[PDB]
Symmetry: C5
Subunit: 204 residues, 5 copies
């Protein structure tokens, strides 16, 4: 694994091929999770931030930016959407959690909680995923779409198999995240495919 503290992936151009694969040994279906990361893009079209597909299942867990001020989460191909006041262009810190028992999904944008939504109560997110940054998967690992590609910078990505309490979400926003057991930016296993460059983070 590699410690990417203080660094970002730069997806420096639009394409249907540039991407990063994130590797996790996740074998157990997820009942709960929290996912946090920081991103900086000047795209105004929609784009995928985090794409997690499993065999036979598109949009099994997907974080997708619809337009300025509007974020969607998909769980098992069902979607919820939440709104927020934001500037454009601007760096953003995004957390999202989901809890099967209640179905509640919660976005936090720059440490501010969005209105809670709910979906897929009782569902388990399937395991053995392919996880992709920079492109949105329609297949198990592929079938990308140029108009959903992420162009810009991503970093500080963590994913936990629990629902973090607010204090721990704020800690992540402030730059001291709890160590994470699904994905952890400070101990990350990844594969760059195509034109993706690792650079220091200069915009926090």
């Amino acid at each position: 694994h590699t410690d990417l503290s203080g660094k970002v992936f730069v997806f420096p151009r639009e394409s249907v091929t540039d991407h990063v694969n994130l590797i996790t040994p996740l074998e157990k279906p997820l009942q709960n999770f929290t996912l946090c990361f920081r991103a900086y893009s000047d795209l105004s079209r929609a784009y995928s931030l985090f794409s997690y597909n499993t065999q036979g299942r598109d949009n099994e867990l997907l974080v997708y930016k619809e337009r300025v001020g509007e974020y969607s989460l998909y769980i098992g191909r069902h979607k919820v959407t939440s709104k927020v006041i934001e500037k454009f262009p601007a760096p953003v810190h995004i957390c999202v959690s989901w809890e099967s028992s209640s179905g509640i999904a919660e976005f936090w944008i720059n440490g501010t909680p969005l209105v809670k939504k709910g979906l897929r109560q009782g569902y388990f997110v399937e395991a053995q995923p392919k996880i992709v940054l920079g492109q949105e998967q329609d297949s198990y690992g592929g079938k990308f779409d140029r108009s959903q590609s992420f162009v810009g910078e991503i970093g500080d990505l963590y994913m936990w198999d629990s629902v973090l309490p607010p204090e721990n979400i704020l800690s992540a926003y402030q730059g001291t995240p709890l160590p994470a057991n699904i994905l952890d930016w400070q101990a990350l296993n990844y594969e760059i495919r195509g034109y993706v460059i690792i650079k220091p983070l200069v915009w926090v």
Copy 2:
């Protein structure tokens, strides 16, 4: 009866069936009242915040958000509306009072008094209500309308059979409400129907 201090009802999806019934023993018609609560929604269409119907009488006491910055109160099916500068989306704290003797209705939004309006001077709000959060009633307890449903979070709801002076309204807004004899968040008798989840309040 349940103490919901520090908690909210989450109506996590749009529907024509998800709702909470609030039970009060109120039997004497009301000359005066004050109603306070906090809400957080990213709907921009109109929606009902607090729906109180009596037998044979639609919109007997209704707090209805027309659009961003515009709030209506119905008394006995007659309406007044007042405007305020506000951000969107954003949590809101709302108090509203009405006094039969003068007919005066006063909204307070995030501690700001709106322009006073007046209606139903001399009227008495009927008692033995059905009170619903999450949907707007057109019947005694039912006949909901998807396009009036409330999607989002509501908490800290109190209702008194008198007009609170401004200092007591600010106390509610600050988080130190007087005890309340019609509805009280710290001793609430409620019935969840459909998809409504109780969660901690994280947005005040």
Copy 3:
């Protein structure tokens, strides 16, 4: 008379009949005057703030809000209009003075002087007026127009038979007006006609 310190007139609904008559001991034509008051309304259409008519003479002295940010003064049926940056809805403190010798009219909005205009140099405003709040007169005392009615709250009204220097205007704005010899809120003679309610001032 009546001491309305700390209180406002509330015109709680649109109508063509609700109004207040103000009674002045004014037997002499006016060469100079200053008029100050506070108002709070969420109307965006035009409306009359202060209507003073004499026999055979419509708009003999009239303060009329044309639209957000635009105020007009009529003297002997002639009009001037001045603009200002303001928020909507918002309480406002308005002073207006006029003097025959120069014809100069000056509005002050929330203690800010508007651009001076001029009209009716050499003219004397006629005596023996009917003075009305809540409606715009077209006759001596009447002939109202619903689309010119004032809905909202008015308080702290004073009128002097001289042109106040700026430091006295600012004293009025801050809540310490000099004693006033035409109309005085602390010693006011008035009649309520229709639906007008007196309430405490809560927005200053």
Copy 4:
């Protein structure tokens, strides 16, 4: 001469006749100058601020406001224009300088330098002007145009036969102008024609 310290000319109405003539025994052609003054108008159409014509020469030196945020200088009938962020309506302090040697024209608006422009390098502004406030001259002293008339207040007008450095512009802006040898508000020779009233300056 007259000392107008603390006072303004008020042009209280739109007309094609109201104006002030400024008198200066300017007998030698001008190679360099700076002109400063304060103005307050809520016109949104174009208008002349300072009109200097010589025999057979229209727009020999003219300061003209095109629209909110846009100011023009004419030298010998040729024009430059520069833009600025400004509020409307609002008082403004305006300085403009021009230098034959380089042709450079500087506007300063509320103490802020606009982008430099250039025109008429090597030219001499003709002597023996008629100088008018309130109207734009097309002839030697006349041929006004109602739609270019200045309605509002003008004060603190100074004109120097040199290009003032920045600190001298700050000095004028803050109400402490350097002594001036072409026109000086504290020793001004002027002629009022029509409806122009001298009043105290209350908006600084």
Copy 5:
């Protein structure tokens, strides 16, 4: 060489001829560079800020302002574009760096980093350039276009044959740049062609 500390080039008018040539002894192809300068213009159409062409190669290194809030860099006739929130008109400090090994291009606008883009990975910028301010070259030293001309002021220009770290970019922004080996405002070799005037910098 000339020390232009505290001075700017003023391009006082639109034209297809006014320009400055910048002379550098650059003989080896450039792998990496940083370019910083300050500019002030009230043009809203597109314009060239810095035009570097080599024999037979248009837009070999070009910094081009597309519209308010949008900056482009060309390397070997390929383009990237980044967006920023900015006021108009307003002075600006611009740095841009590019590195062949990664292809990464980074704009800094008033010390704020824009989203990184990438182009021309592995390419070397050709040497023996003609470098022009005030006009956009389509040939080696010429073939200008009036609608791409720069009207306004430019100063404090430095170019280095390395990618400056962030703290050094802030140094340049604040007025204490590192000495620079390709172009240096304190030791600049330049030629004025047409109407370009050197004046003190008054807008920092």
